[PDB]
Amino acid sequence: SSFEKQQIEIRKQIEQLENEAVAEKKWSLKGEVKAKDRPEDALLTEELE
Amino acid sequence: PGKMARTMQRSSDVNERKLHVPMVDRTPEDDPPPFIVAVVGPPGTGKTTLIRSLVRRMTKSTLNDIQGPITVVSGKHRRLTFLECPADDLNAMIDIAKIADLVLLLIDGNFGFEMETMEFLNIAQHHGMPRVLGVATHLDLFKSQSTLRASKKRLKHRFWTEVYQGAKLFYLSGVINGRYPDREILNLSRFISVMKFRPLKWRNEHPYMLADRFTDLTHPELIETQGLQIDRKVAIYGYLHGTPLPSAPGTRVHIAGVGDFSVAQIEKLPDPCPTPFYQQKLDDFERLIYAPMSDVGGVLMDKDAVYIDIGNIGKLIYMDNISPEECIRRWRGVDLEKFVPYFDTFEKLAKKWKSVDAIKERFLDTWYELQKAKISKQLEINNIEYQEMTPEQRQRIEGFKAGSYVRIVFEKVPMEFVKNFNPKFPIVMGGLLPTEIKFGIVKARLRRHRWHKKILKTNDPLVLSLGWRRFQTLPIYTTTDSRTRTRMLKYTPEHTYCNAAFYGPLCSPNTPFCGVQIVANSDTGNGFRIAATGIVEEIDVNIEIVKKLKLVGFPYKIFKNTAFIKDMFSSAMEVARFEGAQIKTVSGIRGEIKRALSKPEGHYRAAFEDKILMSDIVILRSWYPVRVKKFYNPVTSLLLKEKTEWKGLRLTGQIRAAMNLETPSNPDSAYHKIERVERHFN
Amino acid sequence: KLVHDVQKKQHRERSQLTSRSRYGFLEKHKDYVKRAQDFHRKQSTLKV
Amino acid sequence: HTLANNVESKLRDDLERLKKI
Amino acid sequence: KYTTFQGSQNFRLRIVLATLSGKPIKIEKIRSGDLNPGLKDYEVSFLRLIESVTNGSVIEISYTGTTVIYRPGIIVGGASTHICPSSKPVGYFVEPMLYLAPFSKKKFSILFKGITASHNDAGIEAIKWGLMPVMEKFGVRECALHTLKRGSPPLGGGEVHLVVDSLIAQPITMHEIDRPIISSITGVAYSTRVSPSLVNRMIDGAKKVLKNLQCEVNITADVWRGENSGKSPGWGITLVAQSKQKGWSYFAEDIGDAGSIPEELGEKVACQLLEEISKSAAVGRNQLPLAIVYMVIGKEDIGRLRINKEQIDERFIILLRDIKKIFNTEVFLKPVDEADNEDMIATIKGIGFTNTSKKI
Amino acid sequence: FEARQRIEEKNKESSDYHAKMAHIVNTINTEEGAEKNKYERERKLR
Amino acid sequence: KEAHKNAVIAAREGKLAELAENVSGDGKRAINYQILKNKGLTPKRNKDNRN
Amino acid sequence: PFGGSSHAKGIVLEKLGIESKQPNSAIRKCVRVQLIKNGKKVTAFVPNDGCLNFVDENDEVLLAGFGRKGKAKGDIPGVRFKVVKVSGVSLLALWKEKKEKPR
Amino acid sequence: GPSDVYVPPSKKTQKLLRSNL
Numbered sequence A: 001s002s003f004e005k006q007q008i009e010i011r012k013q014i015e016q017l018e019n020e021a022v023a024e025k026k027w028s029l030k031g032e033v034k035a036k037d038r039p040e041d042a043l044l045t046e047e048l049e
Numbered sequence B: 001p002g003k004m005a006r007t008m009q010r011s012s013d014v015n016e017r018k019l020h021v022p023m024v025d026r027t028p029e030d031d032p033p034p035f036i037v038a039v040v041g042p043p044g045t046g047k048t049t050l051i052r053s054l055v056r057r058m059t060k061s062t063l064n065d066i067q068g069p070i071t072v073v074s075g076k077h078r079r080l081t082f083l084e085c086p087a088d089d090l091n092a093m094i095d096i097a098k099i100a101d102l103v104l105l106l107i108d109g110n111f112g113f114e115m116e117t118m119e120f121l122n123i124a125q126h127h128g129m130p131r132v133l134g135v136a137t138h139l140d141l142f143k144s145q146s147t148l149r150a151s152k153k154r155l156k157h158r159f160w161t162e163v164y165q166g167a168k169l170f171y172l173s174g175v176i177n178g179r180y181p182d183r184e185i186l187n188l189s190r191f192i193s194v195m196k197f198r199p200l201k202w203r204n205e206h207p208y209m210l211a212d213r214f215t216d217l218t219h220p221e222l223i224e225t226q227g228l229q230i231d232r233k234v235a236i237y238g239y240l241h242g243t244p245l246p247s248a249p250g251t252r253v254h255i256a257g258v259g260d261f262s263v264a265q266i267e268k269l270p271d272p273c274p275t276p277f278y279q280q281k282l283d284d285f286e287r288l289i290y291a292p293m294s295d296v297g298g299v300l301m302d303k304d305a306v307y308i309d310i311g312n313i314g315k316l317i318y319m320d321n322i323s324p325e326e327c328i329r330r331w332r333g334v335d336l337e338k339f340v341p342y343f344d345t346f347e348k349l350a351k352k353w354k355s356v357d358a359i360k361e362r363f364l365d366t367w368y369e370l371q372k373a374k375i376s377k378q379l380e381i382n383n384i385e386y387q388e389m390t391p392e393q394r395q396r397i398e399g400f401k402a403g404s405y406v407r408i409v410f411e412k413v414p415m416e417f418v419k420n421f422n423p424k425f426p427i428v429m430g431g432l433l434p435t436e437i438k439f440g441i442v443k444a445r446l447r448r449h450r451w452h453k454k455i456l457k458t459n460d461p462l463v464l465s466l467g468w469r470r471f472q473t474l475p476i477y478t479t480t481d482s483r484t485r486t487r488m489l490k491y492t493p494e495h496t497y498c499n500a501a502f503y504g505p506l507c508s509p510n511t512p513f514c515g516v517q518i519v520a521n522s523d524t525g526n527g528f529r530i531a532a533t534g535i536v537e538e539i540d541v542n543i544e545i546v547k548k549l550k551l552v553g554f555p556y557k558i559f560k561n562t563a564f565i566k567d568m569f570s571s572a573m574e575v576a577r578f579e580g581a582q583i584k585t586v587s588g589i590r591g592e593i594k595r596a597l598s599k600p601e602g603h604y605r606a607a608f609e610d611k612i613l614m615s616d617i618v619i620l621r622s623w624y625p626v627r628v629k630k631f632y633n634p635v636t637s638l639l640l641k642e643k644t645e646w647k648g649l650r651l652t653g654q655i656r657a658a659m660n661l662e663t664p665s666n667p668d669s670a671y672h673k674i675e676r677v678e679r680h681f682n
Numbered sequence C: 001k002l003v004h005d006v007q008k009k010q011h012r013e014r015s016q017l018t019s020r021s022r023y024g025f026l027e028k029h030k031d032y033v034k035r036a037q038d039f040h041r042k043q044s045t046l047k048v
Numbered sequence D: 001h002t003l004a005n006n007v008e009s010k011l012r013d014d015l016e017r018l019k020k021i
Numbered sequence E: 001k002y003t004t005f006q007g008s009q010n011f012r013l014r015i016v017l018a019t020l021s022g023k024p025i026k027i028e029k030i031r032s033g034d035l036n037p038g039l040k041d042y043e044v045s046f047l048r049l050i051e052s053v054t055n056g057s058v059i060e061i062s063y064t065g066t067t068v069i070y071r072p073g074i075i076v077g078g079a080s081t082h083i084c085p086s087s088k089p090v091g092y093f094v095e096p097m098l099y100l101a102p103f104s105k106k107k108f109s110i111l112f113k114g115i116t117a118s119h120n121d122a123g124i125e126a127i128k129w130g131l132m133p134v135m136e137k138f139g140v141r142e143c144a145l146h147t148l149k150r151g152s153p154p155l156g157g158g159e160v161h162l163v164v165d166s167l168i169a170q171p172i173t174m175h176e177i178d179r180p181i182i183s184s185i186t187g188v189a190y191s192t193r194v195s196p197s198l199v200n201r202m203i204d205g206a207k208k209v210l211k212n213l214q215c216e217v218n219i220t221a222d223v224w225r226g227e228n229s230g231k232s233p234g235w236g237i238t239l240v241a242q243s244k245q246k247g248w249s250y251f252a253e254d255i256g257d258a259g260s261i262p263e264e265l266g267e268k269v270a271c272q273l274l275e276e277i278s279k280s281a282a283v284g285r286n287q288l289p290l291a292i293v294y295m296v297i298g299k300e301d302i303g304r305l306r307i308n309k310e311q312i313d314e315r316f317i318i319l320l321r322d323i324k325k326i327f328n329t330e331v332f333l334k335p336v337d338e339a340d341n342e343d344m345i346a347t348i349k350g351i352g353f354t355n356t357s358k359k360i
Numbered sequence F: 001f002e003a004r005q006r007i008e009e010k011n012k013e014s015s016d017y018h019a020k021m022a023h024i025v026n027t028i029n030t031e032e033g034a035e036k037n038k039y040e041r042e043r044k045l046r
Numbered sequence G: 001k002e003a004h005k006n007a008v009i010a011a012r013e014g015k016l017a018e019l020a021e022n023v024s025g026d027g028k029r030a031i032n033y034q035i036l037k038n039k040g041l042t043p044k045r046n047k048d049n050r051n
Numbered sequence H: 001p002f003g004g005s006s007h008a009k010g011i012v013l014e015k016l017g018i019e020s021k022q023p024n025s026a027i028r029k030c031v032r033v034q035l036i037k038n039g040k041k042v043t044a045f046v047p048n049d050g051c052l053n054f055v056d057e058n059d060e061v062l063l064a065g066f067g068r069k070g071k072a073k074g075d076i077p078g079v080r081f082k083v084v085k086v087s088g089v090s091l092l093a094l095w096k097e098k099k100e101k102p103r
Numbered sequence I: 001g002p003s004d005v006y007v008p009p010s011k012k013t014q015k016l017l018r019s020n021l
């Protein structure tokens, strides 16, 4: 039935949000970012003010 | 004139006490609906017993197996609707506090209070204050009358802190036979039938109702051919409240706890409980309780198996198979992108008007009371303009007004709902608004609820109730750096309102809302449960929120006033894109970054304003954009079978424990103690 | 007056990196104002 | 000096990205 | 994508009602059966204007130019600039945003560049004097339409600047049952790059017709000198008749053609005026759709407006059929009491409506 | 180029804000001060 | 390194035992002293004024 | 003052200066209320823009006098009122967290 | 002509092109 169908789909979306929310953050999403501990030239390609 | 001046001052302050804010009613004066009463309290308090006694005394008619919304007639003009909420489940608690009007807050005596009562009062105080009348049960467990008066006065003063300090809670002495003392029950009935109600904003804006009985419509032919999977038609019968629900069938409503259905077809019914004026006027025009799901007489109706005890221009325009050409042709007997309407030519107009004959005759006490007068004049205009051509309008331009028995059939309700329904849980319909359909991200301001324990977190799931619907979302908390931009915080300012943003179904601005953490009853424990309270301010579809990232770099060669900095950047193209820029050291000295040193690849030179030292760290701030997770999980409460323990998305502390990890904590970030030995210069 | 204590929280102050410890004692604004006060005094007397 | 091939490829790709943005 | 409409009839009004209401519509067969079929360019540009003012709205043209799938977003507006393509004037590009002014989130400060006047569509003085008073009587308090440069066909080069400041929550209910008492007559006679003698001859035409009436008549002379007068040369006229006690307004305008005569142009607009007054009842025959949309959308209440049998025509019919298609709103037409005239009170019970787009 | 755009924009935004706040404060003082001095001028009499 | 990890997770498990071991075995919940006395945000006060 | 009474009711009409940058400012504490005795618009202080965050919109305040003694450093004279209670709960109690705001 | 030349625009109608010993 449709209710278990969409509940299954929600369960996939939960698992993704789950391991995403526990895993290690993005280089820019930290603060105090050092040119060693970020990928090279990402600052060049990207946009920030 | 001393005492005259004094009592003049007292009377003026009396008048300004008696004044208030004007507000529309949208609740009629002919067949006003049954005022809803919710009986609410901790688990084994005594709701069922109380409701059995109160029904018996009000309508001479005893009862067993009370379940579901029992309405009775009371007074010459009131119809009360007793409904008990099984206060294990917070979703029953939440929607009942949204739709109630009189709540009988039933507290134990020997405990003083519980977190169920406190949680309910907080939900009421945010979503719109009903009228609260306390009763104090379990008074027969005391032993010493001095102590009895002690606890009674203590409870009275705590309660009066919570509610308006006029709500007089009454005390019920003890069970005699399964029901309560007759005289004290009589006194309770006198209070609830004298109490006067006020209207609240959500109920004035929406059409809502409480489903009185429920029926499923499918051919069991289809059930056999499909195999108890196919979503079913469902008819739901009940009263209405709130505002004229429009009758053009195809509108959208939210069955709270299930989903977002749309009405297939609606039609009204003559109600099974009429007040005496309806009784006299309507029966003389021609010539007491209702509790369908529950027992009355001696029967109760199951799915099927009843159990018994032991024993013209108007339709011309709107007639849509007609072209407008013959419409006006019959009535006597074009494009709209353009603007100037079709006249006739100059010469015919001019000779047709050499005169001006058809047109020479066309040519030639307090502020509060005033606002109230305006509003009442509008209400009586409403009434009289219906009175011209009553019939048509009563079905069609008005919808069905507040307080008329209606049945509604919905398409494609899930099999799990119609299966696992039990009559204990109240089910409600709220009509929507053409905003409240939509889906954008909302912006609120919210605080940690005061009685809580832990502060909140961003990207941390918050169940919240907002309007009719209850859903789970992933908010992100925001400050304005003194009203310039919208920086992203990572917690909640523990004793203050902070902004918040989250993708979820839109709701009108200025709306109160209330958010909880965990809602499964498997996991509560002794702590409180409401977590944040707040108000939604504006609506849009994308917001830009920023996180301040600062790139650090260290100086490696220092002249007077000019230093060559290292490992902030990784290539000279990168430095080129960032040069000329602002920079500052920890110590407060400013500078700009000027030219990319070419021979080693990271460095640059930057010219400070004072002599930087080697023990210094230059930094550069910059705001990265952060964006909102589009997760949206409606709380489908009662499709589930166990009807509590709806387990949504976990939290971060729970999942680190569950997957067996540790809290990420880098070492150089936690503080120390600093002893600076005093510095003499040469 | 109208101010909570938790408004008057008393923020703590950080210190040097580890990997940069051997340039000890990362100077904040206090130490800097000591340093520049004194240099300006020496320069003034020397100009006289 | 196919390492210099690597760095000229890195150069063109970076400048593609920027002038595109 | 759900609610489907047919044909290029009343295109921009269908779009405006979709934006105001919120229901996704699907127009199809826009002059498909035609020698040069498809969506016309001025219609395309008006859609571009809609995506400028709203936010989060999606418009998916069929690649053949017939079917438009519009799913409305919310209003944000603000300040912007639009090049009206040279086939329709800025009147046709302002009248919808005039409908949608006071429900936005910020103010409307739009700049328009292009032709400023045409035969078919409303002009600057037409809007400023005939459609502004409808919203100024529905509750909008500070609307304005500045003329930074007045163009003329067929090059234009004219610029207008619409600014709408009052962001009302919902338009108040209108109650107008008596036929209005008309008081004074004023007008504007404007000229771009031809002679002052010509604008005086226009005034001569209008006054020649209006010699009969005993009411006050006054027509200002706007000649645009120097640079801010636009490129192509032209001249035109508009008249309004105003009732002071309730501030109601009646109007008619027309433009001098390439080689017409200003005298009979003035007589033409005057006979336009008087004929419109006779066929009118409290609202001009072209101010009508503004009032009806505003009364529908207004707060939950019975609103009353007196209209005339002369005004009830086929365009009125197709308007109210559109209203029922979008909003599911009946309109009740009771007849008036006086045995002399022939009028119907249109009563519309305005549905609940607000700005859910705003700030607190 | 982005430097020119950024700096010029930021300065204009801050100057306009300053004039805005000064207009609010000046109007508040002017209107309300008229009212308060009027009330006290009455009050000294009675 | 894994010994360090097991130590810290075990210390958290034991501590969260010492915390969550505040549950009363009876089902009915109770008012915290905070929500019972109903007082909040008060400055450090003095026993010498408490008498 | 405002009648004979020593407290007037009002309804919060709007807020003044909510884009003013410096927090706790005089401009960041003024609110603008119309008194629903007279229908008179007049601007009231609040304490403490935290308390200002508790007061919302169309919300039935109780103005009293403000009555300060001597000219402060940066104030706005001309405001004479202060907001005491909003919908019944009083602002000091709300801010000190004894009571919660009933809609 | 005259009215054309007349500065009633500049005067008034700039309104009307927008709004002892």
Ligand SMILES: Nc1nc2c(ncn2[C@@H]2O[C@H](COP(=O)(O)OP(=O)(O)OP(=O)(O)O)[C@@H](O)[C@H]2O)c(=O)[nH]1
Pocket (backbone or CB within 6 Å): B042, B043, B044, B045, B046, B047, B048, B049, B050, B086, B137, B138, B139, B140, B141, B172, B173, B174, B175
């Ligand atoms: N001593 C004493 N016992 C009571 C009182 N009220 C109820 N009880 C006992 O507790 C039960 C009444 O509570 P109920 O009404 O059944 O419980 P409820 O509050 O309806 O909630 P549910 O049990 O979940 O339906 C009876 O079995 C009584 O014996 C009271 O005032 N005094």
